């Protein structure tokens, strides 16, 4: 019997590469998505063509609300329903947009940015652990969390809370054999809405290669942390940033 | 005239000591409280006896909800209505209790722990800056990287607060508003706690084998708001007697 | 009786500013210097005409060598010889220049960069403690230690070591009632070798005021840490950098 | 032709495990040693039995001295001499013993503890870079650098300097495509001299399984960092500590 993984926000970009690499390694996968239904169904098709009955999709909004605990329990339940087990949780889904201090309401911005980046990872970790081999959680963090983007306080607060969660859950779940770690990209696949001039600005900042990470280079670090070569690693966050966070202003 | 400060959760313990030292420094103060009305009023009366019309109280719940932004705007508004200005914001109010991974619902725990420790501070910061030696001091935690077992939501809240301190220091520096943190290790121990359990913590502290008084915590806050810290922003001053340096 | 302080490299710039503020606070001061004899004696003259018999000079090379332990022991001894006590040690003296990975021998550069920034503070800390109220040590650190200047590896290695000493000495000397803390400037008084244009480059990167810290502003944080207002503070490094360390590439 | 790796202090324990795993992955290796000549040749013999002429030994003292630069240049040269290339440098050799603030002179302890943990890594880095594909350097760090052992200031100073070197060299050598990373054990193979009951005290503190890391679990992280799966990673230090560093006093 093959192990199974949940990857949140897996229809596109980095989450998609993570799901694909997990699948190539021998994992059965839940592809969680919010809006990207066609891309999700498309990916599960591709993976199932390769090895039948090894991928399903699971739709959920991960914005904070009184029903978020239920939705997170459902993502984990969907893994047990399809595969009879759940060995790996990857917390990848994330809202990312500015929220300056000086059309969405501030209530909604807090709900989305803190919900996706922090509260949903927390609830998913709870549900994952309560449902419980080589078990582990990998949280997608941010190498720039101490040198934050300007006017991104809510986003940056969420990513900080995710560091806190990584550490707290590593400590608490250790006696259950569940390891909890992070991968912190600096600049990888750039925002779809970002202009080409900004993208090149950022690329020119990276010491190693003057370019962004492929989604695949981020996934590689995720694969290492879930693997048997990382059996003593818990509470660790691996920067995959080509040296970006080392460059002064 | 005299500057003015808002201190959240100022009725008791550390928040009380901060409001008192700010007032002794020459600040007029808004004493925010949630449940401790009698303590908050008794403080206001004590301070107004010192100097008339220099202390007011302001009640609010700082739990996350749809009304929290309004409550936070109103707390800032009260300082302006009382004193005509708002020079200092101290984010001190905090819920703190275990939330194990394995009689409140989890969504209430999220609302209270993340609300008080992180979201309320962010909203208050927003309202404070929009209304503008201006500065904000956030009460953090020296043990954020070596957290208490089964305190994930609290620990998440305090990490968020660090992120807030850094992000707001960056973004508010052009307006000349400094944003800093004070991080206690072990200070005034919970009210319930038996002396035998307080002693376990006190014995861990290298400097004196004793917890910080609320006054020692307030001293660092006073430093950070003063003219002696005018180039200090984005900084978190540990006040922990070396506790965070002690391995398991 | 007035307390006594040793400040290393105190003939000019930040070290002078620290010695002056300690003096104005009521301390008697040992003005350590290496090459700046005229400036050191000039300073002591100014302080002594303020209050008679309150400042002395002390020459020492703080380069690493087999005699460095004797030299640091003697700097402390001179505070006791002059004032009968030594309450405060400020580790300020510092060599700062590039050492590219790809003039002085490399062994000389190691000796000067590591000696001044790390080994001497360590030896002085040993001597200060062995000779032993509000006793403390303040180490001048660097807010940019994790976002270092290009080609400054040895200088950066020395400032990181100084962080480890601050932490290790806070831990070990706490039972003796000696507190050990740091102040970490970002950009303060720029090097005299630096031209106005390069100075302005640095100035423009600082969020808080677009300007460097005055030497007085750095001295202020030192005076705080040595005061009774910081009686519970040990192993803390306070950045005084106007937000510089928070700014991304 | 196979790539080639230099591993310092490779005759025993963790260095030996790193050398063995690199060799099993397909590297030719230089086994550096100081006093452990017999063990080093024994290791070389075992590896050469596996594949002829794929393992050589190299003797050097890594204590700071006037001759250290030439010694480090020779270690690097021995790899080029033996194998015609040098692809990987693992800075593992390390002196570790207490140096109380309040046998060997203190200046010897400085030379050993700072020389092995920091200055030799710096000089070897210089030589490795100067003599220059998937090139990288891995530095053996310490997960407990911020919660150090009581009375180990110089050791802790050297490990902190090694973090600064990891960062500084990652930044400066990125343009050359040389990556520079760290692996940070907590408790792995306990020192031979350590008492048995004292060893169990440490094991009982580790959240993940209340045991120490095997030397192989440390080596696993090294293998990852030098591999093609870590090609975007530089300036990163991976903790392999089973959560020990997350545990409060
Ligand atoms: N350079 C980088 O891209 C970079 C840099 C630093 C950190 N990271 C981190 O690495 C991870 C992957 O980055 P990425 O750029 O691939 O992510 P992304 O494209 O920005 O977001 C990935 C997915 O998150 C899901 N998501 C957003 N809001 C959601 C909500 N309310 N409920 C449920 N799902 C929601 C979306 O799903 P749907 O499409 O299905 O709606 C989206 O496809 C993220 O955690 C990110 O913060 C990335
Ligand atoms: N004490 C320590 O050893 C320690 C250690 C590390 C960090 N800290 C930090 O230092 C700060 C002060 O600590 P402390 O021990 O003095 O705090 P505390 O007594 O635990 O709480 C301070 C106040 O926060 C207010 N508060 C709690 N929940 C609230 C809510 N839902 N809405 C609005 N206000 C609420 C309460 O006000 P009412 O009484 O009016 O309801 C309470 O009096 C806190 O931020 C804390 O996290 C303290
Ligand atoms: N200035 C800044 O923007 C800045 C930024 C970050 C950190 N810092 C730190 O803050 C502190 C003060 O900075 P600064 O710019 O005022 O310092 P600095 O002028 O560069 O040097 C201070 C003194 O160090 C002494 N020194 C140099 N080599 C010595 C040696 N071999 N033996 C004994 N003494 C030696 C010199 O004494 P003599 O002149 O008598 O020979 C010099 O005047 C330093 O630790 C520095 O690293 C400063
Ligand atoms: N073991 C752990 O629990 C642990 C924990 C934290 C960090 N680490 C780090 O991981 C690395 C390996 O640990 P380990 O326990 O395997 O190390 P170790 O056994 O204490 O030392 C490894 C080798 O270092 C070499 N060495 C010592 N002094 C030297 C000198 N003056 N010149 C040249 N070589 C010298 C010795 O080589 P010879 O035998 O040939 O003389 C020794 O066998 C070290 O960097 C260590 O600091 C280990
Ligand atoms: N979700 C998300 N967080 C991000 C942080 C930085 C960038 Cl470039 C892209 C991101 N996408
Ligand atoms: N609010 C609050 N946070 C705290 C952290 C530690 C302790 Cl002892 C008491 C606290 N009270
Ligand atoms: N000693 C010394 N270290 C320094 C670091 C930065 C600057 Cl601007 C000046 C310095 N002077
Ligand atoms: N060199 C060396 N550094 C070390 C740090 C911790 C332990 Cl247990 C053993 C070590 N051996």
Summary?
With 249 residues, chain A is an alpha/beta fold. Chain A has seven helices and seven strands; from the N terminus they run E-H-E-H-E-H-E-H-E-H-E-H-H-E. Chain B: It holds the Pfam family adh_short_C2.
Description:
The complex is a heterotetramer, with 3 copies of chain A and 1 copy of chain C (249 residues). With 249 residues, chain A is α/β, with parallel strands linked by helices. Chain A has a single domain, classed as Rossmann fold (3-Layer(aba) Sandwich). Chain A contains 7 helices and 7 strands; from the N terminus they run E-H-E-H-E-H-E-H-E-H-E-H-H-E. A 7-stranded parallel sheet of chain A has the order 3-2-1-4-5-6-7, with helices on both faces. Chain A is globular, with a radius of gyration of 17 Å. In chain A, 63% of the residues are buried. By secondary structure, chain C is α/β, with parallel strands linked by helices. Chain C has a single domain, classed as Rossmann fold. In chain C, 43% of the residues lie in helices and 14% in strands. Chain C contains 7 helices and 7 strands. Chain C has a 7-stranded parallel sheet, sandwiched between helices. In chain C, helix 1 packs across helix 7 and helix 4 packs parallel to helix 5. The radius of gyration of chain C is 17 Å and the shape is globular. Chains in contact: A-B, A-C, A-D, B-C, B-D, C-D. Chains B and C meet through helix 5, helix 7 and strand 7 of B and helix 5, helix 7 and strand 7 of C. The site of one 6-chloro-1H-benzimidazol-2-amine has 6 residues of chain A, from loops. The PDB classes it as oxidoreductase. Keywords: short-chain dehydrogenase/reductase, oxidoreductase, trypanosomatids, pteridine reductase. It forms a tetrameric assembly.
């Amino acid at each position: 019997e093959a192990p199974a993984a949940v990857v949140t926000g897996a229809a596109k970009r980095i989450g998609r590469a993570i799901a694909v690499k997990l699948h190539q390694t021998g994992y059965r996968v839940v592809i969680h998505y919010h809006n990207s239904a066609e891309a999700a169904v498309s990916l599960a098709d591709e993976l199932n063509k390769e090895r039948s009955n090894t991928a399903v999709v699971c739709q959920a909004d991960l914005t904070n609300s009184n029903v978020l605990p239920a939705s997170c329990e459902e993502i984990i339940n969907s893994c047990f329903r399809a595969f009879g087990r759940c060995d790996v949780l990857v917390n990848n889904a994330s809202a990312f947009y500015p929220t300056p201090l000086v059309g969405k309401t501030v209530e909604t911005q807090v709900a989305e940015l803190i919900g996706t980046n922090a509260i949903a990872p927390f609830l998913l970790t709870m549900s994952f652990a309560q449902r419980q081999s080589n078990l582990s959680i990998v949280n997608l963090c941010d190498a720039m969390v101490d040198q934050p983007c300007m006017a991104f306080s809510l986003y940056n607060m969420g990513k900080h809370a995710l560091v806190g969660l990584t550490q707290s859950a590593a400590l608490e779940l250790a006696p259950y054999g569940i390891r909890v770690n992070g991968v912190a990209p600096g600049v990888s696949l750039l925002p779809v809405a970002m202009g080409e001039e900004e993208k090149d600005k950022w690329r020119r900042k990276v010491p190693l290669g003057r370019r962004e990470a492929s989604a695949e280079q981020i996934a590689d670090a995720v694969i290492f942390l879930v693997s048997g070569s990382a059996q003593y690693i818990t509470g660790s966050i691996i920067k995959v940033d080509g040296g970006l966070s080392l460059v002064h202003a």
